Amino acid sequence: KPITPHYGPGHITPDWCGFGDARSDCGNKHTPKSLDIPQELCPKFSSRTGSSMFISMHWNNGSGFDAFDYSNCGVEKVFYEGVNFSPHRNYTCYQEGSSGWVSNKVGFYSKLYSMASTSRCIKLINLDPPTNFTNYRNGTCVGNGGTAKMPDNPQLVIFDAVTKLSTQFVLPNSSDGVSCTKHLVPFCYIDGGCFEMSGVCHPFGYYYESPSFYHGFYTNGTAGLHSYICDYLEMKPGVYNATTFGKFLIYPTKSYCMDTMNYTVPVQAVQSIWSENRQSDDAIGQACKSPYCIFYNKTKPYLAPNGADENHGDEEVRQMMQGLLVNSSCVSPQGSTPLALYSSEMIYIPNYGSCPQYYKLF
Amino acid sequence: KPITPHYGPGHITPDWCGFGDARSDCGNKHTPKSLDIPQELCPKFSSRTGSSMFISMHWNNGSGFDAFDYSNCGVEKVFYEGVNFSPHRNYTCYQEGSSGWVSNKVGFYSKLYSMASTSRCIKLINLDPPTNFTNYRNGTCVGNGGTAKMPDNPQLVIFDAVTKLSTQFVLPNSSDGVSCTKHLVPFCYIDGGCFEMSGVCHPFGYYYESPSFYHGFYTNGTAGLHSYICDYLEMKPGVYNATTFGKFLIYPTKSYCMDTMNYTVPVQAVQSIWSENRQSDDAIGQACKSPYCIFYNKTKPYLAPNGADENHGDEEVRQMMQGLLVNSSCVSPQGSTPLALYSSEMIYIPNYGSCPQYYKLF
Ligand SMILES: CO[C@]1(C(=O)O)C[C@H](OC(C)=O)[C@@H](NC(C)=O)[C@H]([C@H](O)[C@H](O)COC(C)=O)O1
Ligand SMILES: CO[C@]1(C(=O)O)C[C@H](OC(C)=O)[C@@H](NC(C)=O)[C@H]([C@H](O)[C@H](O)COC(C)=O)O1
Ligand SMILES: *[C@@H]1O[C@H](CO)[C@@H](O)[C@H](O)[C@H]1NC(C)=O
Ligand SMILES: *[C@@H]1O[C@H](CO)[C@@H](O)[C@H](O)[C@H]1NC(C)=O
Ligand SMILES: *[C@@H]1O[C@H](CO)[C@@H](O)[C@H](O)[C@H]1NC(C)=O
Ligand SMILES: *[C@@H]1O[C@H](CO)[C@@H](O)[C@H](O)[C@H]1NC(C)=O
Ligand SMILES: *[C@@H]1O[C@H](CO)[C@@H](O)[C@H](O)[C@H]1NC(C)=O
Ligand SMILES: *[C@@H]1O[C@H](CO)[C@@H](O)[C@H](O)[C@H]1NC(C)=O
Numbered sequence: 253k254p255i256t257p258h259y260g261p262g263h264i265t266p267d268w269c270g271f272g273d274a275r276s277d278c279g280n281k282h283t284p285k286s287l288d289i290p291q292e293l294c295p296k297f298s299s300r301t302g303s304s305m306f307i308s309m310h311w312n313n314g315s316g317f318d319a320f321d322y323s324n325c326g327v328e329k330v331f332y333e334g335v336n337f338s339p340h341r342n343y344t345c346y347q348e349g350s351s352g353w354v355s356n357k358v359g360f361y362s363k364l365y366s367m368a369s370t371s372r373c374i375k376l377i378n379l380d381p382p383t384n385f386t387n388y389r390n391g392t393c394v395g396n397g398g399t400a401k402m403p404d405n406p407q408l409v410i411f412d413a414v415t416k417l418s419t420q421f422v423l424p425n426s427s428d429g430v431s432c433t434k435h436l437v438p439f440c441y442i443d444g445g446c447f448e449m450s451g452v453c454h455p456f457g458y459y460y461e462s463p464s465f466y467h468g469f470y471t472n473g474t475a476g477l478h479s480y481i482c483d484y485l486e487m488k489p490g491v492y493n494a495t496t497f498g499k500f501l502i503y504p505t506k507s508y509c510m511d512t513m514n515y516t517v518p519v520q521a522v523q524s525i526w527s528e529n530r531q532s533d534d535a536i537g538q539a540c541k542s543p544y545c546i547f548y549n550k551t552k553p554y555l556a557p558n559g560a561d562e563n564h565g566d567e568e569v570r571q572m573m574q575g576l577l578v579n580s581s582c583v584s585p586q587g588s589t590p591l592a593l594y595s596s597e598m599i600y601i602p603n604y605g606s607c608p609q610y611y612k613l614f
Numbered sequence: 615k616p617i618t619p620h621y622g623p624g625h626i627t628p629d630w631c632g633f634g635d636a637r638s639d640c641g642n643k644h645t646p647k648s649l650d651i652p653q654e655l656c657p658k659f660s661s662r663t664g665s666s667m668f669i670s671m672h673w674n675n676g677s678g679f680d681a682f683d684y685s686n687c688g689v690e691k692v693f694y695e696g697v698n699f700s701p702h703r704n705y706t707c708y709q710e711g712s713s714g715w716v717s718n719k720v721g722f723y724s725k726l727y728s729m730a731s732t733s734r735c736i737k738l739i740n741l742d743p744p745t746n747f748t749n750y751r752n753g754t755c756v757g758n759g760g761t762a763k764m765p766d767n768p769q770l771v772i773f774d775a776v777t778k779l780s781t782q783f784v785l786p787n788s789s790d791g792v793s794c795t796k797h798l799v800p801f802c803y804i805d806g807g808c809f810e811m812s813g814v815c816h817p818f819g820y821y822y823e824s825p826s827f828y829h830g831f832y833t834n835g836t837a838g839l840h841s842y843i844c845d846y847l848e849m850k851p852g853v854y855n856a857t858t859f860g861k862f863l864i865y866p867t868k869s870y871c872m873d874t875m876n877y878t879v880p881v882q883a884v885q886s887i888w889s890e891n892r893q894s895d896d897a898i899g900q901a902c903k904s905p906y907c908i909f910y911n912k913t914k915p916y917l918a919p920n921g922a923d924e925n926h927g928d929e930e931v932r933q934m935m936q937g938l939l940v941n942s943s944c945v946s947p948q949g950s951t952p953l954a955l956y957s958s959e960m961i962y963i964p965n966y967g968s969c970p971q972y973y974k975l976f
């Protein structure tokens with residue numbers, strides 16, 4: 253008798269973990285009303301209310317960002333966070349705007365998901381400060397009247413005068429138990445031609461370099477609309493330099509330390525949005541693509557009649573997350589299944605485990 | 615009764631294609647003795663003797679390179695070429711050496727395979743020349759006593775004097791029937807500090823730029839060992855600029871035009887090596903990784919007792935390629951299968967179609 257796949261995330265072995273926010277945080281005071289997952293699964297998630305893996309990449313606690321030291325391990329992974337950086341946040345650093353930050357948001361989540369698929373542990377870590385330099389200013393945002401905090405990672409600096417400089421930062425091989433066989437490191441820049449400071453238009457740019465690596469940005473065109481853009485990089489542990497072109501420089505202060513597993517396993521991401529009376533985005537949906545990530549989209553609006561509030565407790569997702577209670581045998585875009593011979597609908601890729609074949613073929 | 619998967623490439627639907635070299639070229643005079651595939655499958659392959667998709671990316675006919683206008687379409691793809699650029703070629707442009715070109719080789723094949731997995735057609739195309747410029751030299755190799763041809767793509771140029779310049783190149787939306795919804799474009803540079811020309815050490819670097827794109831390289835350190843390194847880029851059709859920092863500039867003269875299909879399907883690559891009395895590399899094996907590419911490695915040496923010569927006709931691969939004669943129902947790392955209920959061994963990912971489950975689970 254053919255089994256119907258249960259739409260939502262699953263796991264085939266005890267060795268899975270989740271990553272999330274308030275909707276998976278049993279430390280939040282509204283528990284279990286604010287959950288979108290089963291309560292006995294909280295210990296499998298690494299989650300903090302108000303945070304997201306995107307925020308935590310860029311900011312420390314402060315100026316409205318709630319940061320979190322995300323850390324977990326699992327062959328199989330369930331990602332359910334992101335909404336805490338949506339257009340609703342109304343953030344911008346220069347003139348990139350919200351849509352500009354949806355662009356950054358996709359870039360990050362795209363890199364994280366694909367890197368995660370070849371990893372078991374993911375650990376946000378603090379990098380040691382670079383070799384000291386002097387006569388410098390930290391970068392600042394003009395966005396939101398100068399109240400928008402430019403990220404703590406990567407850290408921007410501005411030299412009082414044009415200068416020749418290269419500075420050393422370290423991406424470690426390990427962080428307290430975990431192996432960092434690779435790192436997810438942000439490289440952000442401001443585009444749109446030369447950058448105006450005190451009536452002088454300086455060429456904007458700098459680079460990450462080492463003997464086996466290079467990533468850079470440069471511009472000295474006619475000034476126009478400036479955008480704070482981020483690239484997200486896979487960098488191997490080791491010693492790197494950050495080099496200026498004269499006036500500007502960034503160094504990373506944080507990375508996502510990740511190890512490596514030989515068998516690659518698609519991650520799972522569930523849609524993280526707000527109620528309809530708040531601006532959401534489809535970054536997760538755009539970032540979580542085949543074949544490295546399995547996307548479970550919400551068909552309905554965010555509706556929580558039995559939750560703590562209109563944004564915490566959604567019926568749809570609660571139903572999806574029910575699948576993480578059963579030791580499944582197949583994890584697919586169509587959902588999870590137990591070990592069975594036939595299926596009620598075609599299983600498509602990316603999948604893994606042992607999946608039933610479509611009955612109508614037999 | 616459980617079926618054993620046939621180790622090697624397969625196809626589930628008539629809509630597959632191959633990409634290859636002499637070992638899949640029915641135009642070569644040694645046919646069918648020099649083939650590694652079934653002869654009636656030649657019409658499915660796009661192949662030229664002595665060529666490879668890596669060579670064709672970088673060179674026109676001449677100076678020992680045999681170029682080919684590779685072009686094919688298929689939901690499912692079988693890649694079997696590469697050996698015509700192995701360490702055996704003894705090529706180098708600067709001091710990167712053979713291993714340096716194995717590095718370039720991995721980069722290309724890695725990008726091609728993953729891009730191909732989201733495409734149906736792959737077409738090598740010629741780009742229109744950039745807006746004219748003057749007082750310039752084409753770049754040249756020092757490697758092999760100045761007899762090594764620096765690639766025709768991307769084209770390097772050197773300005774007689776330090777200059778401000780930006781030049782326009784076009785990545786088209788279509789090429790005679792096919793849609794180029796994306797392009798695979800090479801961006802190559804020479805690293806190792808400032809570049810010595812006529813007793814002056816110039817900063818080496820330049821960039822590709824547009825309003826929605828940037829890729830660059832720069833260096834002005836102490837001169838050391840110079841290496842010609844390539845990055846391989848996914849760029850959308852449109853108008854781009856190539857900008858210099860003063861002395862150097864590259865523009866692309868070719869790209870791989872590719873369209874987009876919504877369902878992503880892992881490609882298949884078979885090991886392309888020489889006989890043991892020739893230096894091969896494992897670029898294909900390194901480039902063809904899960905989950906975007908399925909690798910069929912050779913367990914044996916290249917042995918062709920019934921071929922045209924020690925390098926054309928291999929027994930092992932000939933046996934693998936037998937699987938492309940049957941309309942399979944499952945394509946896996948373990949090989950192809952027909953539609954069956956059970957399998958003699960565990961099917962692992964990346965796979966696609968409808969695959970039998972491991973008997974020992976039942
Ligand atoms: C502090 O005032 C200024 C300055 O003259 O330095 C004015 C300057 O704004 C003007 C009037 O051009 C502003 N730059 C830009 C491009 O918006 C510029 C930057 O916002 C500020 O210097 C911080 O820059 C970076 C890189 O973080 O700040
Ligand atoms: C033609 O002679 C020279 C020159 O003085 O211009 C000598 C120069 O070699 C010496 C003696 O430093 C060579 N540069 C390098 C780094 O090897 C340099 C380059 O090989 C040549 O200019 C081509 O350069 C590029 C970018 O293709 O060529
Ligand atoms: C931020 O502060 C909260 C309490 O406000 C605390 O639980 C947490 O440790 C902090 N986050 C980080 C990343 O330090
Ligand atoms: C962001 O702005 C919109 C309208 O512009 C508003 O509805 C929303 O409450 C604002 N959000 C915050 C957190 O201030
Ligand atoms: C800039 O910020 C860094 C990191 O947050 C901090 O350690 C340093 O004190 C700041 N420097 C200046 C000059 O404000
Ligand atoms: C940068 O651009 C400005 C305006 O085009 C020019 O005057 C200045 O000399 C340039 N600087 C460099 C280093 O090219
Ligand atoms: C996900 O769901 C929403 C609402 O149905 C839809 O608007 C959006 O386009 C979907 N995105 C993806 C990537 O499936
Ligand atoms: C190179 O020349 C061969 C014959 O030597 C010819 O078949 C082919 O068209 C040429 N290749 C390209 C890419 O023009």
Ligand SMILES: *[C@@H]1O[C@H](CO)[C@@H](O)[C@H](O)[C@H]1NC(C)=O
Binds near residue numbers: 702703704
């Ligand atoms: C490349 O060099 C090796 C030995 O250095 C030699 O065996 C081989 O024949 C050379 N290949 C060519 C094509 O000249």
Ligand SMILES: *[C@@H]1O[C@H](CO)[C@@H](O)[C@H](O)[C@H]1NC(C)=O
Binds near residue numbers: 750752769
């Ligand atoms: C440089 O090479 C290009 C492309 O092969 C060619 O069209 C041009 O004539 C060459 N220019 C010079 C100055 O040698």
Ligand SMILES: *[C@@H]1O[C@H](CO)[C@@H](O)[C@H](O)[C@H]1NC(C)=O
Binds near residue numbers: 808834835
């Ligand atoms: C490049 O480096 C050399 C040697 O360090 C220096 O003399 C020269 O002025 C530099 N040029 C630029 C544009 O930084």
Ligand SMILES: *[C@@H]1O[C@H](CO)[C@@H](O)[C@H](O)[C@H]1NC(C)=O
Binds near residue numbers: 896900912913914
């Ligand atoms: C492929 O096969 C050769 C010979 O058995 C081996 O040396 C090589 O490491 C293999 N590489 C991969 C990626 O499987």
